[PDB]
Ligand binder design. Structure first.
Ligand SMILES: [Cl-]
Lengths: 257, 257, 258
């Protein structure tokens, strides 16, 4: 009676334990299914993160490098200086220490300063720059080069300049510099006392002097002609006197007899 | 009691199988924990990696800010809202908003600058030009020329004055600009009417006038000599007439007696 | 019944140990489940983080576009496939493929431009130069000069002619306006030397000298004519006297006739 019932009790306890263990196995399976999802998720994330690392490293190597250097492959500077400063509206500043303070200006070169509107500065009042390899200008608003200035000034007539920089204006020596002379052509007639005289004008002045001589001359030729005419009158009077005397001498000789 | 011993055997059999399942379950739990331990570590690694990517990405975001939006690096800067630069020509360079380097191997420098001819650098356009400032005097033949250099080519030279119309070619004023005059040396003798004459020619021309005067004096001297020739003849005839009369007067007086 | 009661006690003890094992197992499973929840959550968070990073990186890549590959920003641009610019000199600047700023504080501007002297801006090289265009006329002494300015300056210039070989022809200086007009030369001093230009005052004095010579000479001629006129008047008086004598002789002879 007591034992048979206790055996049944144990048998039911075993039954319930078997069910509990099966329930526990099921829980382990449910957990494992989540761990499987997590393991897979981790795998997906490892891939995505190494893919982003690569993309970030490429961004770093490229555009990162232009930030720190301030240069691209085609716009380069070699400098430790302070940033360029495009201060003015629509200004452009190129090079460390450069400052384009004025509207629509360009400061070009390290430490260049553009402080007037609509200009391109290639330096400053303390450091200027020559501009080199400039081809001869053609259009009116092209820059001119030294060779063009030299060609344009060749043949220019100049005074001598003294050592102190003053010009000696009191003499203008023409000619080749070794004894040669220069003919000055296309000269107008002098009007003021200190104007140069031209050749037509010289010739005209000789002709005036000769005309004055003729005017004086012909006054004396009138006197000389008056003397010439009077002289013929005297000659006729003499011939008449000689004739008279001949007749007197003949008359006296006939009185003699 | 046969049923009781049968049930005891059944109980023991069930217990053996339960004990076996418990051992299997304990192994299963360990398999799961080992994977969970791996996943936990994988997650900690991913947290660290993602945190690092975040910092590398934030640093890049800080660096590229002004470069993408303002188109400017620390040494290449512009202050503008306008249209992109446009390097259209092969090997061209365009710097500044609205700039257009249209032609081959050209450079458009500055906001709205336009380069429309091959192998040129434009500092502006036909709608807006720019002076170039802080240019040091050119030395090489292909260096640019500054205003100082042009002014120095003018200084000390002989130049026509301008009107304001522009150059007045009708007068060339020499001298020092304050009353002083200029002696012009090495001047060749004038050939054409409009050539400047030299002092040698002036002197010769005075000599010609005086020679002309001397010639006319000579003509008058000969007319006079001719008059004095007839005059001496007259003088001799008179002396002879006077003599005749003396002899007549004496002859008449002797007749009187 | 005592052999059986013993086996029953033994069985109850086995069940006790099994119960204790099962309770230990449920505790372990609770512990694992808690860690799995933390992991699941951490993964969800990571998924969002990583997706946000993806978007930020993509937006970076799109912001840049081709700034790296073409070396150009929206405002500093070149169209070229050549070698990198090279700013070699201290404080130098190089702009354009193949450009080389070799010298200190220099600027090489444009494709293949070379700056090889200090403190210069080169717009080309010894083998390829460039004109500089749309330059407004210089005002300041250190402003660049344009072609219009050079031409205006040259137009006011007095110049000898240049031969084809570049020598200057000093033998002729042609003034005038180019067509056929002439130039009056002002502020000229009196000539001293035979090859000096003469001025108008000097011409006028020369005319005076000549006129004076004429007056002196004609005065001397006038004196000579006067001298002849006087001697002619002497002859006239002698004749009048001779005529008078003859009148008296003729009257005297007539009185002798009676
Ligand atoms: Cl997990």
């Amino acid at each position: 009676k007591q034992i048979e019932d206790k055996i049944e009790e144990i048998l039911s306890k075993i039954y319930h334990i078997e069910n509990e263990i099966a329930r526990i196995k099921k829980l382990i399976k449910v957990t494992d299914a989540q761990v499987s999802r997590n393991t897979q998720s981790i795998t997906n994330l490892n891939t995505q993160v190494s893919n982003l690392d690569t993309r970030v490293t490429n961004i770093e190597n490229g555009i990162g490098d232009i930030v720190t250097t301030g240069s691209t492959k085609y716009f380069k500077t070699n400098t430790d200086g302070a940033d360029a400063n495009a201060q003015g509206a629509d200004s452009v500043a190129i090079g460390s220490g450069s400052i384009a303070a004025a509207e629509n200006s360009v400061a070009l070169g390290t430490n260049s300063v553009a402080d007037e509107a609509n200009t391109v500065s290639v330096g400053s009042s303390t450091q200027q720059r020559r501009i080199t390899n400039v081809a001869a200008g053609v259009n009116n608003t092209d820059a001119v080069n030294v060779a063009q200035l030299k060609a344009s000034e060749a043949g220019s007539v100049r005074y001598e300049t003294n050592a102190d920089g003053s010009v000696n204006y009191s003499v203008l020596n023409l000619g080749d510099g070794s004894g040669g002379t220069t003919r000055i052509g296309n000269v107008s007639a002098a009007v003021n006392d200190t104007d140069a005289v031209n050749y037509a004008q010289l010739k005209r002045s000789v002709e005036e002097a000769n005309t004055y001589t003729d005017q004086k001359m012909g006054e004396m030729n009138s006197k000389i002609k008056g003397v010439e005419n009077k002289m013929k009158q005297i000659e006729d009077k003499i011939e008449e006197i000689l004739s008279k005397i001949y007749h007197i001498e003949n008359e006296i000789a006939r009185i003699k007899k």
